[PDB]
Amino acid sequence: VEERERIEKQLLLEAERINEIDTLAKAHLSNHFNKEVLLAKGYTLKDIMQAQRRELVRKFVPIEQIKAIAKVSDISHIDGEILEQLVSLAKVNIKLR
Amino acid sequence: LSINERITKELAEVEERERIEKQLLLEAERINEIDTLAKAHLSNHFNKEVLLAKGYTLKDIMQAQRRELVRKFVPIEQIKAIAKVSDISHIDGEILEQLVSLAKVNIKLRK
Amino acid sequence: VEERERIEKQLLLEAERINEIDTLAKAHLSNHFNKEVLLAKGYTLKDIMQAQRRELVRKFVPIEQIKAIAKVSDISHIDGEILEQLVSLAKVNIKLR
Amino acid sequence: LSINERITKELAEVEERERIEKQLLLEAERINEIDTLAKAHLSNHFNKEVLLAKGYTLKDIMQAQRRELVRKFVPIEQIKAIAKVSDISHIDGEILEQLVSLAKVNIKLRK
Amino acid sequence: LSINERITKELAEVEERERIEKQLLLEAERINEIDTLAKAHLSNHFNKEVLLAKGYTLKDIMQAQRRELVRKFVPIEQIKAIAKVSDISHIDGEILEQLVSLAKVNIKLRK
Amino acid sequence: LSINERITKELAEVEERERIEKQLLLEAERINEIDTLAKAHLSNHFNKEVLLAKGYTLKDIMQAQRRELVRKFVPIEQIKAIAKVSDISHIDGEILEQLVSLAKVNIKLRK
Fold this sequence. Notes:
The structure is cut from a larger assembly and holds six copies of chain A.
Chain A: H1 2-28, H2 35-41, H3 45-60, H4 63-69, H5 81-96
Helix pairs in contact in A: 1-3, 3-5
């Protein structure tokens, strides 16, 4: 049952990450990308989170840094470790902002 | 071995040689970019001649210049974000390539 | 895989040599012998590099050294490490120039 | 032709061997300098003549003279710190060259 | 693979791990010596905390402290004759170990 | 054998003797060129008479004269471009021929 306990630990970790991302995105980007309206438009939870992350990058991380770390100007398909780097860069930019 | 096999082998060999040629051009461009960045933004102590005299491989010279450019231009929080850590002691590689693209971005915005 | 690693090392070495040759040839000879226009005219990369080297010899290395060290006045067919000697002499000439 | 340039490479390698001959000559000069150090700072019993009579190789004579000079001039604290060990009996080599350099410095400052 | 081969492989593995452990302990003691020398003989501005904040590797901190200690204690003639040059900026290594040993005994004789 | 075997043998023997004669003429021209160069550009102490009295082979005389001519005319900026090191004390052959050709060019442009 400790396997399920650790699974629940990881669930709590990603839930906290999602909550933090949503809380900062609501105050930073817009309310058009709210979880409720995105779900109504028909996007899965992970798709909503990654779209919010990409918007956070496009807001805080300027497009030059975007293409610098993402190695491609379009964040449409860079998702993964590069996307995590970019969202941490967005966190850094808002920290220094 | 029929004619279709002969032609496809010949074209595959030609395309492989052309791809190797493109790789040579890309590596030449990388060398030019590293030399220009080292001459423009980094100190004379990190020159290829003195590094080779100290006994470092060419790739080691490239990654050392890249790391110095990242530390000079890329702020430490940006490093903690992209590299996911502060220390660039062993971060050399494609993450370092992203970080040096960031360094060139920083010099473009700094000019 | 270390065989392919050393092959890539040799690729890097020749790429660096091509870089040095190009960075001096563009500023020394002309824009007519640019890599793009030569490729459009239809010359392979090795042919382009050897033609540029021969032009470098014809610009810096004097004809007496061409007909004495390389034994032929025409650099059209002398290619090899004799061409290496000629381009080294051209490097010395441009260094003293 | 290809033969001309390959023979050029051959004689360039001969030229490198000539440089090896020069560095051999430089090593011989270092040998005579160590001999002068041994005469100036060590007992007559450690002379090359008596050591050869006892039957020791020339390199053995040089390393014995170097070890004795290090023990005489370089204090044992530096000796221990440098060799990472107190004993010099198995420290012949580049570390020994560094130690005899330190001994030369010690006699220079002593004078 | 016979019994003797098994025993020799096991013994070699054990000895290798023991040597690695000894190397770790030696690095520990080296970190000690750098820390104590920096605290006792060098200014607060060269502390590991502030140097790491400025963004220097641990090895860079160690060699910088060593070079500063050598300049502070070891005289310039001694430097010029040990390292064969006045500048210590490119003498990190075994010769740096020699200069820092000379400083270590210099402070002992100063006391 | 049919007569065609000698139609090639008879001609081969004559051609071999003709090539040997041409080689003898080439050697004579080489000796004449060495004599002229030694008389014109090198000191009297390097004359064939005094060198033979000191007991050196004719080929040794030729290579010594060539080496002295190379050192006198060809500067190090080409000696290290062809032989790759400055001195040619033990170096002669194809690089020596290239260097004496370069020295002939050098004296021609000097005049």
